[PDB]
Amino acid sequence: NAMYTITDIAPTDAEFIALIAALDAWQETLDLSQLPPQTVIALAIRSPQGEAVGCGAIVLSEEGFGEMKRVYIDPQHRGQQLGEKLLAALEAKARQRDCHTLRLETGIHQHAAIALYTRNGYQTRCAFAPYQPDPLSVFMEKPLF
């Protein structure tokens, strides 16, 4: 089963905020709403009930880079390739916006995410604006076409 659904979401949607809040509550083991809205791609994965169950986002720069962030899948829906489904969907949207390279930063603690990106062609790299090699952070990127 990946007969879940993918749809746009407002980063200001209560459902988005809830996934994000859960993401941040876990990382303990705001910012997306402010930005110019053209510059943000944000998506959700929904159960067949219609419950937002995962999400993620890409912030696009004017030189064709995109930064991937705020990716999370609710724990009860893991084990069945949703990260994959979502990731591909964010990439597809980034291409339609001429984005040529996706990069991301996550903590070294985030093993599931890190492996998901690796399984799909992201490769480790150095710090990029606006981060300074906080190590440990892990920076990754992938050429899209």
What strands, in cross-sheet order, belong to the sheet with 65-73?
5-8, 40-46, 52-60, 65-73, 101-107, 137-143, 123-125
- What the block records as the tokens of 48 is 């067949």
Pairing of strands 65-73, 101-107: parallel
Strands 5-8 and 137-143, bridge-based pairing? unpaired
Instruction: Tally Cβ neighbours within 10 Å of residue 142.
Output: 17
**CB-based burial of residue 103 (10 Å sphere; 0-12 exposed, 13-18 middle, 19+ buried)?**
buried
d(CA 20, CA 18): 5
* Contact assessment for residue 140 and residue 113, using Cβ atoms and an 8 Å cutoff: no
Q: Check if the beta carbon of residue 65 is closer than 8 Å to that of residue 103.
A: yes
Is 57 within 8 Å of 70 (Cβ atoms)? yes
Give, in degrees to the nearest 5, the angle at Cα 42 between 50 and 66.
150
Q: For the CA atoms of the chain, what is the radius of gyration?
A: 14
Place of tokens 């930063």: 105
Assign a CATH topology to domain 1-145. Aminopeptidase (3.40.630)
